[PDB]
Structure formats: structure tokens, C-alpha cells
């Protein structure tokens, strides 16, 4: 009935295979520091470890599959805090215009640690655009990621 | 394929760990 899904499960998984560059598959001060640092710098370590304990229910000091899924599945209809998605956007739009460009992204995607020529992205942004502007805006960004 | 999701979600994990800090106002 649903055993043939594993679609969402596979999605998170890929996120762990992409975020975890070591091979353990867990969000830790290490994978967090490295990335977060290459995204917005990293102040101290004690603060990062304390921030992870304020959420780690068990105490492994890290996060696995159930805990991650739980971090998202565990929710409160409480007023939508788009501030999250919003912030995520700002990261993508580094400069400060609001829309994504071929060069802009290429810089953010290339810094993640992989190799994506200019063609791929170009084809990605294109499909993302249904009207015919050429660049991605907030409406298309929400209309595409929002699905329910 | 062209899923800005794994890319977004991923950043969502870290971005969330940055905001989890319940306002260090004090
Ligand atoms: Ca790891
Ligand atoms: Ca844990
Ligand atoms: Ca821009
Ligand atoms: Ca457009």
C-alpha cells in the first residue's frame, strides 16, 4: 500500500548523504561547523555543542534518522514561521536582489562541494520558470516548493 | 533531478540549527 513509497524517505536520505561528508550520516558540530562556517562563519564551539544538546533528546550529542525525521514530523501547527524558509532564501540570494541568477546560484551550488557546469543550472532555472522571465522570483519559489 | 529540495532542505537543517537558539536575549 505505502511500502512502494519510500519517496520522501529517499529525499531526506539524500540530504544526509549530501550534508554528511564524513560517512556517518548525522548532523554534528563537525558537519555543522564546516558547512555553517562556509555559510556564515562559526563563533565558538561550546555554543554549538550547547545548541545541539538543547534539542538532542537522547544525548548522543548528534542526530540520526528517527531524530531528524522527528525534528520535522514533530511539529506544532503554531503560526507558520516562514522566517525559516525566508532565511534559507536569503542564503541562496547572496547579493540582495530577491531573484536567482545563473551566476549567483553557480557560486552557491559550486561552494557546496560539487561540480555543476553552467548548463545544468541554466536548465534547472529554466524549468523552474513557467511564465518566461528567465530568473526565479519569490512567487515561483513559493509556488514550486509549496505543495499541499 | 532539478529538486531545489535536497539543496533547500539541506540548508534548512543547518539554518534551523542556527535559529533553534531560542533568542539569547539574556
Ligand atoms: Ca556526519
Ligand atoms: Ca540523538
Ligand atoms: Ca541576486
Ligand atoms: Ca519567472
CSV table of C-alpha atoms and ligand atoms in Angstrom, one decimal:
chain,number,residue,atom,x,y,z
A,1,UNK,CA,0.0,0.0,0.0
A,2,UNK,CA,2.6,2.5,1.1
A,3,UNK,CA,5.7,0.3,1.1
A,4,UNK,CA,6.0,1.4,-2.5
A,5,UNK,CA,6.5,5.0,-1.5
A,6,UNK,CA,10.0,5.4,0.2
A,7,UNK,CA,9.9,8.6,-2.0
A,8,UNK,CA,10.1,11.1,0.9
A,9,UNK,CA,12.3,8.8,2.9
A,10,UNK,CA,14.7,8.7,-0.1
A,11,UNK,CA,14.7,12.5,-0.2
A,12,UNK,CA,15.8,13.1,3.4
A,13,UNK,CA,18.4,10.3,2.9
A,14,UNK,CA,20.0,12.1,0.0
A,15,UNK,CA,20.1,15.2,2.2
A,16,UNK,CA,22.1,13.2,4.8
A,17,UNK,CA,24.3,11.8,2.1
A,18,UNK,CA,25.0,15.3,0.9
A,19,UNK,CA,25.3,17.1,4.3
A,20,UNK,CA,27.3,14.3,5.8
A,21,UNK,CA,30.7,14.4,4.0
A,22,UNK,CA,32.3,12.1,6.5
A,23,UNK,CA,30.1,9.0,6.1
A,24,UNK,CA,28.3,8.7,9.5
A,25,UNK,CA,25.1,10.4,8.4
A,26,UNK,CA,24.4,12.6,11.4
A,27,UNK,CA,24.2,16.4,11.9
A,28,UNK,CA,27.0,17.2,14.4
A,29,UNK,CA,29.0,20.2,15.4
A,30,UNK,CA,31.5,18.9,12.9
A,31,UNK,CA,29.3,18.8,9.8
A,32,UNK,CA,27.5,21.8,11.1
A,33,UNK,CA,30.7,23.8,11.8
A,34,UNK,CA,32.3,23.1,8.5
A,35,UNK,CA,29.2,23.9,6.5
A,36,UNK,CA,27.7,26.6,8.7
A,37,UNK,CA,31.2,28.2,8.7
A,38,UNK,CA,31.3,28.2,4.9
A,39,UNK,CA,27.9,29.8,5.0
A,40,UNK,CA,28.0,32.4,7.8
A,41,UNK,CA,31.2,31.8,9.8
A,42,UNK,CA,31.4,29.9,13.2
A,43,UNK,CA,31.8,31.8,16.5
A,44,UNK,CA,32.7,29.4,19.4
A,45,UNK,CA,32.4,25.6,19.8
A,46,UNK,CA,30.9,25.4,23.3
A,47,UNK,CA,27.9,27.4,22.0
A,48,UNK,CA,27.4,24.9,19.1
A,49,UNK,CA,27.6,21.9,21.4
A,50,UNK,CA,25.2,23.5,23.8
A,51,UNK,CA,22.8,24.3,21.0
A,52,UNK,CA,22.8,20.7,19.9
A,53,UNK,CA,22.1,19.5,23.5
A,54,UNK,CA,19.1,21.8,23.8
A,55,UNK,CA,17.5,19.6,21.1
A,56,UNK,CA,19.2,16.2,21.4
A,57,UNK,CA,16.6,14.2,23.4
A,58,UNK,CA,18.7,11.1,23.9
A,59,UNK,CA,22.1,12.6,24.4
A,60,UNK,CA,24.3,11.1,21.6
A,61,UNK,CA,25.2,14.8,21.0
A,62,UNK,CA,24.3,14.2,17.4
A,63,UNK,CA,21.2,13.4,15.2
A,64,UNK,CA,20.3,10.2,13.4
A,65,UNK,CA,17.4,9.3,11.1
A,66,UNK,CA,14.4,9.0,13.6
A,67,UNK,CA,15.5,12.2,15.4
A,68,UNK,CA,15.9,14.1,12.2
A,69,UNK,CA,12.6,12.9,10.7
A,70,UNK,CA,11.2,13.7,14.2
A,71,UNK,CA,12.7,17.2,14.1
A,72,UNK,CA,10.4,17.8,11.0
A,73,UNK,CA,7.5,15.5,11.7
A,74,UNK,CA,7.5,16.7,15.3
A,75,UNK,CA,5.7,20.0,14.8
A,76,UNK,CA,3.1,22.4,16.0
A,77,UNK,CA,0.6,23.9,13.6
A,78,UNK,CA,1.7,27.0,15.6
A,79,UNK,CA,1.7,30.1,13.3
A,80,UNK,CA,3.8,29.4,10.2
A,81,UNK,CA,7.3,30.7,10.9
A,82,UNK,CA,8.2,31.3,7.2
A,83,UNK,CA,11.2,33.1,8.8
A,84,UNK,CA,12.9,29.7,8.2
A,85,UNK,CA,12.2,29.3,4.5
A,86,UNK,CA,12.8,33.0,4.1
A,87,UNK,CA,16.2,32.9,5.7
A,88,UNK,CA,17.0,29.8,3.6
A,89,UNK,CA,16.2,32.0,0.6
A,90,UNK,CA,18.5,34.9,1.6
A,91,UNK,CA,21.3,32.4,1.7
A,92,UNK,CA,20.6,31.4,-1.9
A,93,UNK,CA,20.2,35.1,-3.0
A,94,UNK,CA,23.6,36.2,-1.7
A,95,UNK,CA,23.7,39.7,-3.1
A,96,UNK,CA,20.3,41.1,-2.1
A,97,UNK,CA,18.0,41.4,-5.1
A,98,UNK,CA,15.5,38.7,-4.4
A,99,UNK,CA,15.7,36.7,-7.6
A,100,UNK,CA,18.2,34.0,-8.6
A,101,UNK,CA,20.6,34.3,-11.5
A,102,UNK,CA,22.8,31.8,-13.4
A,103,UNK,CA,26.0,33.2,-11.9
A,104,UNK,CA,24.6,33.8,-8.4
A,105,UNK,CA,23.5,30.2,-7.8
A,106,UNK,CA,26.5,28.7,-9.6
A,107,UNK,CA,28.5,30.3,-6.8
A,108,UNK,CA,26.3,28.9,-4.0
A,109,UNK,CA,26.0,25.4,-5.7
A,110,UNK,CA,29.7,25.3,-6.5
A,111,UNK,CA,30.6,26.1,-2.9
A,112,UNK,CA,28.6,23.2,-1.6
A,113,UNK,CA,31.5,20.9,-2.7
A,114,UNK,CA,30.2,19.6,-6.1
A,115,UNK,CA,30.7,20.4,-9.8
A,116,UNK,CA,27.7,21.8,-11.7
A,117,UNK,CA,28.6,23.4,-15.0
A,118,UNK,CA,26.6,26.5,-16.2
A,119,UNK,CA,24.4,24.4,-18.5
A,120,UNK,CA,22.8,22.2,-15.8
A,121,UNK,CA,21.7,25.1,-13.6
A,122,UNK,CA,20.5,27.0,-16.6
A,123,UNK,CA,18.2,24.1,-17.5
A,124,UNK,CA,17.2,24.0,-13.8
A,125,UNK,CA,16.3,27.6,-13.5
A,126,UNK,CA,14.5,27.5,-16.9
A,127,UNK,CA,12.1,24.7,-15.9
A,128,UNK,CA,11.5,26.4,-12.6
A,129,UNK,CA,10.2,29.4,-14.7
A,130,UNK,CA,6.8,28.6,-16.1
A,131,UNK,CA,5.9,32.1,-17.4
A,132,UNK,CA,9.0,33.3,-19.3
A,133,UNK,CA,11.1,35.8,-17.2
A,134,UNK,CA,14.4,33.8,-17.1
A,135,UNK,CA,15.1,34.4,-13.4
A,136,UNK,CA,13.4,32.9,-10.4
A,137,UNK,CA,11.3,35.2,-8.2
A,138,UNK,CA,9.5,34.7,-4.8
A,139,UNK,CA,6.2,33.7,-6.2
A,140,UNK,CA,7.7,31.0,-8.4
A,141,UNK,CA,9.9,29.9,-5.5
A,142,UNK,CA,6.9,29.5,-3.2
A,143,UNK,CA,4.6,28.1,-5.8
A,144,UNK,CA,7.2,25.5,-6.6
A,145,UNK,CA,8.3,24.4,-3.1
A,146,UNK,CA,4.8,24.8,-1.6
A,147,UNK,CA,2.7,21.7,-2.4
A,148,UNK,CA,-0.4,21.0,-0.4
B,1,UNK,CA,16.7,15.7,-11.0
B,2,UNK,CA,16.2,19.5,-10.6
B,3,UNK,CA,15.0,19.3,-7.0
B,4,UNK,CA,16.0,22.5,-5.2
B,5,UNK,CA,14.7,20.5,-2.3
B,6,UNK,CA,17.7,18.5,-1.2
B,7,UNK,CA,19.6,21.7,-1.6
B,8,UNK,CA,16.9,23.8,0.3
B,9,UNK,CA,16.1,21.1,2.8
B,10,UNK,CA,19.8,20.6,3.5
B,11,UNK,CA,20.3,24.3,4.1
B,12,UNK,CA,17.0,24.1,6.1
B,13,UNK,CA,18.7,21.6,8.5
B,14,UNK,CA,21.6,23.9,9.2
B,15,UNK,CA,19.5,27.1,9.0
B,16,UNK,CA,17.2,25.6,11.6
B,17,UNK,CA,20.1,24.8,13.9
B,18,UNK,CA,21.1,28.4,13.8
B,19,UNK,CA,17.6,29.6,14.7
B,20,UNK,CA,17.0,26.9,17.3
B,21,UNK,CA,18.9,29.2,19.6
B,22,UNK,CA,15.8,30.4,21.4
B,23,UNK,CA,16.7,34.2,21.3
B,24,UNK,CA,19.7,34.6,23.5
B,25,UNK,CA,18.2,37.9,24.5
B,26,UNK,CA,19.5,37.2,28.0
C,1,LIG,CA1,28.3,13.3,9.8
C,2,LIG,CA1,20.2,11.7,19.5
C,3,LIG,CA1,20.7,38.1,-6.6
C,4,LIG,CA1,9.9,33.5,-13.7
